[PDB]
Amino acid sequence: GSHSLKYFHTSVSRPGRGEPRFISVGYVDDTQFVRFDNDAASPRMVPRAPWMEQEGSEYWDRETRSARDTAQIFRVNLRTLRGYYNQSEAGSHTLQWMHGCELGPDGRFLRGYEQFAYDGKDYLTLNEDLRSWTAVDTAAQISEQKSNDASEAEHQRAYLEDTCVEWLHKYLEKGKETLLHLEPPKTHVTHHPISDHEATLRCWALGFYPAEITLTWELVETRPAGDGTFQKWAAVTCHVQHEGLPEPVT
Amino acid sequence: RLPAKAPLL
């Protein structure tokens, strides 16, 4: 896999209880590095990785501004999308927005993407050309037209191709000690007897970064340790693939 | 870094 800079934006309308909830989280690869929560008193972008704690106020001012602007545009979008679907004011609804750029082995732009989802279901998607949008619904068609007429894609393309890449480079550098350092799984198998008749084998992987991994031989979803690393196991030899070890350990 | 201008739906 390739280096990336992604953000995951969530807006939730709160009928009766005032302005919608809004949260943005920034990830380089599988490391989270920033957060904005609008439920704070004076809501600001904050660092959420030790290598971001040395950034000046110029940076946090700007990201705080972007996030606040986003939160306000998302508030309007929720109200607008309500009208499109002829839903009442009484019910809570969700707008989500993921966007990210990826580098190739050459450290150049490789691909960008953006997607909006309304109440868990895809709504509007940026196309690979980074020049046009694709609706799913009829509702999303008014959005496509509106976005198209607005040249919304011109803005997102410059972000994805130039900004998102220039800043991904700055983040990989500021936190090289942690982001470029690989950590392969520590593997072992454990014996769990169900009776004298049947037994259960469990292939463990622990303390690995990044979270991409395959356990081959009941497959449990990859999960975080809370120290930056990840954990996984499979159950019924066991083959373990991860970009941190030269060949699959069996 | 965030994009300034979240798209308008």
Partner: T-cell receptor, first 112, second 109 residues
Framework: TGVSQNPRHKITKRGQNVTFRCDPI?????LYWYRQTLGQGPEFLTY????????KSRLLSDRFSAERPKGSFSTLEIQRTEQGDSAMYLC??????????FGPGTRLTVVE | KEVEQNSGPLSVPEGAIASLNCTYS??????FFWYRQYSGKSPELIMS????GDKEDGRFTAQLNKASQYVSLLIRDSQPSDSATYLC??????????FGSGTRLLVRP
Amino acid sequence: TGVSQNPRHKITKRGQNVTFRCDPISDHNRLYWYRQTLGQGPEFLTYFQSEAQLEKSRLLSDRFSAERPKGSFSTLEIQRTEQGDSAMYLCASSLGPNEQLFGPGTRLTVVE
Amino acid sequence: KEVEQNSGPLSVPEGAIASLNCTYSDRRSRSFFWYRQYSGKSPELIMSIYSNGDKEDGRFTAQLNKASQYVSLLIRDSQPSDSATYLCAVMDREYEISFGSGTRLLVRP
């Protein structure tokens, strides 16, 4: 909803104080204050992101000040008003860094 | 100045195409705006352009050239009702707007 500004015209005696108000478009979070004189373009004074005043002109006079207490309406106050303060005081709102739409302005004449 | 406009009076006979032209310094400027401002009135937004090429609205055309860093306004069938100062406004890579000094158009009836 357009951008409201009152008064539209204001006569004040040199040395007096004046206070203009602007109401932006409902869903617009940014509010900008500009001044304009004959055959020049709008000159930046200050802007607000909701309640937060994020910037002011490097050259802004100590006599000029603005507030947006409730993050809604904004007031611009000129103290000890001078002849040279005579100009068009434009307010503009925007939804993030989208288009800036202007109010009908407050024209201040400062008379002897 | 970040944004340049010939301020001098532009005189044009009724029915000619008026060519308003504006030049901006920041090669990565993000959005580009034409405001109409009648004497004693506030600026009215008439064209918004972002992408290389042309936007059309009535007798108005906006032309954006990011390579030459030119932005133009064309007024087809120019009427004296179009006599006004036309303000060029550009938002830089950071999305910070600048208003040029404007160009005074005078459509001779």
